[PDB]
Design a protein around this nucleic acid. Structure first.
Ligand code: NA
Ligand code: NA
Ligand SMILES: [Zn+2]
Length: 327
DNA sequence: CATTAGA
DNA sequence: TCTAATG
């Protein structure tokens, strides 16, 4: 957590690179396990040799570890850090839409900068178009104060279209967080579940709503179960307009909510831990359900959920307010 | 890890 | 169809 820190971060830096700038999937996977195991080791790595003892630890990285151990750096790390092309890829990346593959592509084409990207908006797809267009605002955080504002409106039309709707704004937001990165709206309806062969319109209806009123302003991607967009709060009585913000709404079979809700609510650790517990408590948790374990090794049969509570009750735990779902 | 775009 | 990108 700190005794092995530098090792892990240099390693990851090492890892990441192969992955993006190079197409070294394996090298990259390599760096990661090591960077993983080296992380668990309860003692100060004092040397390669030491490190090497480990699993996934080979000559290659051990070699790396000494250099870093001995001198507070790493050339290879210093060189890449320096490398304009590679720099370039990591940069181009931030563009919503832009991935390693494209990054590389644009780089080879000569598009290394923001501006380069403008000059060639043609070379970009809608997604990137937008991404481009709202790069600043996409990078900005979302003050909960806004989260509230936004949530308020969202719940309003949801209600407005059909009163039979159930929306929940999941994630860190849900968890109290001072700020958030994008709003997540989990959605469902009784008239939709596991079997009831859809009603794409279900999702459609609402998105359309939000737009009709100007909450939604761009569509990154609109599917029959997962809308992915952009939104903005009516810029008041002037002098202050709201930054463009990322939004995701998703349809869910009413029969799958709570778990999903539970789940999307995190925290990553709260989850993992609760989940770990369900196992002992003879169960299985996952993004859509909760199944009872059968000694044979495994088992099925999705227990019925009507609330965050049912899951809780199930694994005989203390209802945790989302507030304290931190871990 | 599953959903969407796109070509 | 596959491949990329988001989460
Ligand atoms: Na080893
Ligand atoms: Na990106
Ligand atoms: Zn999101």
């Amino acid at each position: 957590e700190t005794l092995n820190g530098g090792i892990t971060d240099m390693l990851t830096e090492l890892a990441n690179f192969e992955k993006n700038v190079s197409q070294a999937i394996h090298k990259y996977n390599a760096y990661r396990k090591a960077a993983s195991v080296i992380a668990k080791y309860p003692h100060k790595i004092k040397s390669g040799a030491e490190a090497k003892k480990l699993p996934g630890v080979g000559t290659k990285i051990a070699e790396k570890i000494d250099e870093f151990l001995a001198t507070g750096k790493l050339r290879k790390l210093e060189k890449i850090r320096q490398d304009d092309t590679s720099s370039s890829i990591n940069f181009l990346t931030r563009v919503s839409g832009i991935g390693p593959s494209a990054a590389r592509k644009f780089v080879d084409e000569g598009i290394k900068t923001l501006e380069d990207l403008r000059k060639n908006e043609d070379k970009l797809n809608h997604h990137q178009r937008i991404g481009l267009k709202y790069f600043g605002d996409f990078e900005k955080r979302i003050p909960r104060e806004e989260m509230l504002q936004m949530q308020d409106i969202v719940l309003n039309e949801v209600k407005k279209v059909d009163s039979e709707y159930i929306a929940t704004v999941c994630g860190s937001f849900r968890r109290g967080a001072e700020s958030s990165g994008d709003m997540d709206v989990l959605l469902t309806h009784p008239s939709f579940t596991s079997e009831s062969t859809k009603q794409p319109k279900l999702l459609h209806q609402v998105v359309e709503q939000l737009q009709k009123v100007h909450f939604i302003t761009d569509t990154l991607s609109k599917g029959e179960t997962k809308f992915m967009g952009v939104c903005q709060l009516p810029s008041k009585n002037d002098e202050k307009e709201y930054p463009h913000r990322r939004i995701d709404i998703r349809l869910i079979p009413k029969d799958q909510y709570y778990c999903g809700v539970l789940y999307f609510t995190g925290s990553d650790i709260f989850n993992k831990n609760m989940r770990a517990h369900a196992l002992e408590k003879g169960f299985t948790i996952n993004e859509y359900t909760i199944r009872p374990l059968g000694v044979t090794g495994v088992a099925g049969e999705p227990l019925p959920v009507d609330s965050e509570k049912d899951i809780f009750d199930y694994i005989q735990w203390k209802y945790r307010e989302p507030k304290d779902r931190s871990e």
